[PDB]
Amino acid sequence: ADITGAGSTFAMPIYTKWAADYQQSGGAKVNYQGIGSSGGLKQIVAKTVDFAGSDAPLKDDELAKEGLFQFPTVVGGVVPVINVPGVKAGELTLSGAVLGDIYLGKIKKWNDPAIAALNPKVKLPDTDIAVVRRADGSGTSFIWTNYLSKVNDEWKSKVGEGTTVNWPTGTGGKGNDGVAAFVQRLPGAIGYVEWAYAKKNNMVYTALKNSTGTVVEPKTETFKAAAAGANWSKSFYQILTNQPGKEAWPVVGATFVLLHAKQDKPAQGAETLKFFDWAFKNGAKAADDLDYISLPASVETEIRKQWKVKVTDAAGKAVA
Ligand SMILES: [K+]
Questions:
Q1: DSSP of 163-175, one letter per residue?
Q2: Residue 314, number of CB atoms within 10 A of its CB
Q3: DSSP character for 135?
Q4: DSSP 8-state class, residue 112
Q5: Contact indicator for 262, 312 with CB cutoff of 8 Å
Q6: Where is the PBP domain (predicted)?
Q7: Contact at 8 Å (CB) between 280 and 305?
Q8: CB contact set of 98 (below 8 Å; sequence gap of 6+)
Q9: How many CB atoms lie within 10 A of CB 30?
Q10: How many Å apart are CA 281 and CA 296, to the nearest integer?
């Protein structure tokens, strides 16, 4: 009840765990509502919460327009999950171009030649594909469609990227949970979820062929390989899709916290920063246990330098 955040369901598993551990350690009570990145952005701007979580980072100009400060907390993977007869987790391989053509509505069956080409070992059925996407404004959708735009020209020009897009086709699930539930129950379903949702629900994720041509499974190692080399020190706005590493999982994103740079309630901002400072210091095993990737120590040091300079009371004095 002490501080309240809302937004990204991508980050909800670790924020919820961090908040429980923090309160057990003696820290304030942290309530986090999983409403989607777009809903979280609306609520921090409406100043109905103390911070928002979003996996669709704002550019410098939008942050200045809104008076918000933004910083990353962890990195996570996004995986295709499917419901295909005779196919178990990790057995099927897809690719960026193929994912784009599936979401374009061009590939309609699971025995399509473009899927078959990537799956010599799998006895594919002729099941119709049932496309599932997010109904709510979503940072997971942003990562997904940012990625599709890089690897499928038709998708880039016809649909593009955003927390919402004009999907050519697809059932709309609310949150990562709603997409997960649709995929597990609709035969032939394909969807996209943050990795923790696939693992918790024992979902059938796919491998992906990355830009190097390596078939990579989704796992801590390949998420981490994607995050390598990001220039955090230049800008916190960093998009980690279709990364060039040979073991890089293709669909990865950081997730972000937004709070007002001028704190109407300085003690609220201080408690928010206190919570994430504690999480950076003490929550690394919790993040790893959920297969998120923790930020490098040097990046967390830079974030601390920035939030003492940039999150202040109305007089310009640091809240931390
Ligand atoms: K085959």
A1: SS---SS-EEESH
A2: 9
A3: S
A4: -
A5: yes
A6: 1-280
A7: no
A8: 107, 114, 115, 118
A9: 24
A10: 12
DSSP, collapsed to helix, strand or coil, labels residue 235 as coil
SS3 5: strand
Q: Do residues 227 and 196 touch, judged by C-beta distance below 8 A?
A: no
Rg, the chain, Cα only: 20
Cα 115 to ligand 1 centre (Å): 9
Q: Which two tokens stand for residue 265?
A: 């309630």
* C-alpha span between 250 and 243 (Å, rounded): 6
Give distance in angstroms: CA of 94 to centre of ligand 1.
13
Question: 216: CA distance to ligand 1 center in Å?
Answer: 19
DSSP letter assigned to residue 314: T
Tokens of 80: 């295709």
Separation of CA 110 and ligand 1 centre (Å): 11
**Helices (H), ranges, the chain:** 12-25, 37-45, 60-66, 96-103, 113-116, 139-151, 153-158, 175-185, 195-200, 220-227, 266-282, 284-289, 297-310
State the distance from the centre of ligand 1 to the C-alpha of 117, rounded, in angstroms.
8
Q: How many residues does the chain have?
A: 320
Phi and psi at 204, nearest 5°, equal -85, 95
For domain 1-76+229-238+253-320, give the CATH superfamily.
Periplasmic binding protein-like II (3.40.190.10)
* Domain 77-228+239-252, CATH class in plain words: alpha beta
